[PDB]
């Protein structure tokens, strides 16, 4: 019908490391799209709420946490 003849920062988020699938286990098995962002999760309100309310006290020893289990034996070491 009507064939008549005449006559956005794509490479930037990969470069920065974002929009890449990742997950934090201790937080609601939550998903994170960047490694910088997840590295920012280590200092956060909710992340520290999960730690401290979990019985694992806050700040800088537990930063590298992912799963809930290992930091429990780490806190027993504390």
């Amino acid at each position: 019908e009507g064939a008549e003849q005449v006559d956005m920062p794509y490479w930037l988020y990969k470069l920065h490391g974002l929009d890449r699938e990742y997950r934090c286990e201790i937080c609601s098995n939550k998903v994170y799209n960047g490694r910088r962002t997840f590295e920012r999760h280590f200092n956060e309100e909710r992340h520290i709420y999960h730690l401290r309310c979990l019985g694992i006290e806050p700040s800088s020893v537990f930063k590298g946490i992912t799963k809930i289990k290992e930091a429990q034996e780490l806190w027993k070491n504390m």
């Binding site: 800088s60 020893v61 590298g64 992912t66 290992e70 930091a71 034996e73 780490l74």
Partner: peptide, 21 residues
């Protein structure tokens, strides 16, 4: 491959450390 997947968890590594942070 196997050596890359053989790695212990960083938290498993923390216990060996006197200054884990």
């Amino acid at each position: 491959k196997r050596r890359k997947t053989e790695k212990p968890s960083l938290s498993q590594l923390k216990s060996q450390v006197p200054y884990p942070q």
